[PDB]
Amino acid sequence: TAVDSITQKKFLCDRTLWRIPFSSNFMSMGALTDLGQNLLYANSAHALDM
């Protein structure tokens, strides 16, 4: 038989956590990650919107 149906696709993330390194090379290097120890960062207080 052929009836007219379409495929629906999803994914499942369980017992895993989201993560993105604070590095400009995007690497989990250590404590003082690439963008943390950089020049403009850790000097002045600003505002944040996400």
């Binding site: 950089n38 020049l39 403009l40 000097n43």
Partner: protein, 174 residues
């Protein structure tokens, strides 16, 4: 311009580098406060703690190779060496082995053989800090090397080193 606009430096305990040098109103004078005849005073002796600021910038400062560096060495930045606290022994090892294997049990200088036997217990660190400054020695390190000219010379590595994001390696970076 002719009256030098005074800077200083204030410290960050996280790295060991200066947060910034700015022409600060955090001290600057109540404008047109003085008298018309007595106004040559602030044109003279407000510039006096600018002219002892030059004295303070060389008194204990210890002049640096580059006017604002990156990673500091260990020399003359007060690296504390507390002396190895030397104590001998609370109980004696040689007096305990002989008795407990042959007979008596104990719970305790001791009873049998008192003797001096000491080893060196060095307290002071193997190598001093390479990261930055000890927490409060900032007057001893950073006192404003003030340049009364706002911008002198061609643009390159002129009298610079004011901005915290300004590195020696990169001219202009994010």
């Amino acid at each position: 311009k002719e009256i030098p606009t005074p800077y200083m430096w204030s410290y960050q305990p996280q790295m060991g580098l200066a947060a910034g040098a700015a022409q600060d109103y955090s001290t600057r004078i109540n404008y047109m406060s003085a008298g018309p005849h007595m106004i040559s005073r602030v044109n003279g002796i407000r510039a006096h703690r600018n002219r002892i600021l030059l004295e303070q910038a060389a008194i204990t400062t210890t002049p640096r190779n580059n006017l604002n560096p990156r990673s500091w060495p260990a020399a003359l930045v007060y690296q504390e060496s507390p002396a190895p606290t030397t104590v001998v022994l609370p109980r004696d090892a040689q007096a305990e082995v002989q008795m407990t294997n042959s007979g008596a049990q104990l719970a305790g200088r001791p009873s049998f053989t008192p003797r001096q036997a000491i080893l060196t217990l060095q307290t002071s660190s193997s190598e001093p800090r390479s990261g930055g400054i000890g927490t409060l020695q900032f007057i001893e390190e950073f006192v404003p090397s003030v340049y009364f000219n706002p911008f002198s010379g061609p643009p390159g590595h002129y009298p610079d080193q004011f901005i915290p994001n300004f590195d020696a390696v990169k001219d202009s970076a994010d």
